[PDB]
Design a protein around this ligand. Structure first.
Ligand SMILES: c1cnc(-c2cn[nH]c2)cn1
Length: 209
């Protein structure tokens, strides 16, 4: 049972701009997704300070980077607070309408795409390198759901029957054919060292057989 939704016009405009603008510094997508994971881990940590049972779904707070050259996917896994179904539909827990508005005024006033995270819509930088993005998420107050979009103005939401997560979010980047450098160990290591050196959670880069 798959539900198909239309993006708000402003968000469709944001994704088309990310996809169509010539902009070589694509590597910032990873910084933005790791920063979102860190924000999500901060949220569940804060809730656990007054209610330890919030971590019954998983005590470990971490970020895993899982490249898969056979599937041509880069997966970013975190054990943060996760998102409800309502969060997923409402632009993955962002204020993307007003964030896009501010972002696009900044771009016409000197800014470049690498500053997207300052406007709260850094998730959509995934489409710098991915032709399709799948988001699997589990919030303590909801069931496990799968969000998916290949842009084109629509996204889908369905209950996820796959591997249970416990709690957190898994962003699966189905990479573009010419963006497979982000599956190489030394390239991922370089980007993490360059842009995410002060993230306060363990970031584990998985290796492949
Ligand atoms: C990218 C975008 N959003 C997230 C997230 C996780 N929990 N809540 C929001 C993670 N990575």
């Amino acid at each position: 049972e798959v539900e198909t939704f239309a993006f708000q016009a402003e968000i469709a405009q944001l994704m088309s701009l990310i996809i169509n603008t010539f902009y070589s510094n694509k590597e910032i997508f990873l910084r933005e997704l790791i920063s979102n994971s860190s924000d999500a881990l901060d949220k569940i940590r804060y809730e656990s300070l007054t209610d330890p049972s919030k971590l019954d779904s998983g005590k470990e707070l971490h970020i895993n980077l899982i490249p898969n050259k056979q599937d041509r996917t880069l997966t970013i896994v975190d054990t943060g607070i996760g998102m409800t179904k309502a969060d997923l539909i409402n632009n993955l827990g962002t204020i993307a309408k007003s964030g896009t508005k501010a972002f696009m005024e900044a771009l016409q006033a000197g800014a470049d795409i690498s500053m997207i995270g300052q406007f709260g819509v850094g998730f959509y930088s995934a489409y710098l390198v991915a032709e399709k993005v799948t988001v699997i998420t589990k919030h303590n107050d909801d069931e496990q759901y799968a969000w998916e979009s290949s842009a084109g103005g629509s996204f889908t939401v369905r209950t996820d029957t796959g591997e249970p997560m416990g709690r957190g979010t898994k962003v699966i980047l189905h990479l573009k054919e010419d963006q497979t450098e982000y599956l190489e160990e030394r390239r991922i290591k370089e980007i993490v060292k360059k842009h995410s050196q002060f993230i306060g959670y363990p970031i584990t880069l998985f290796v492949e057989k």
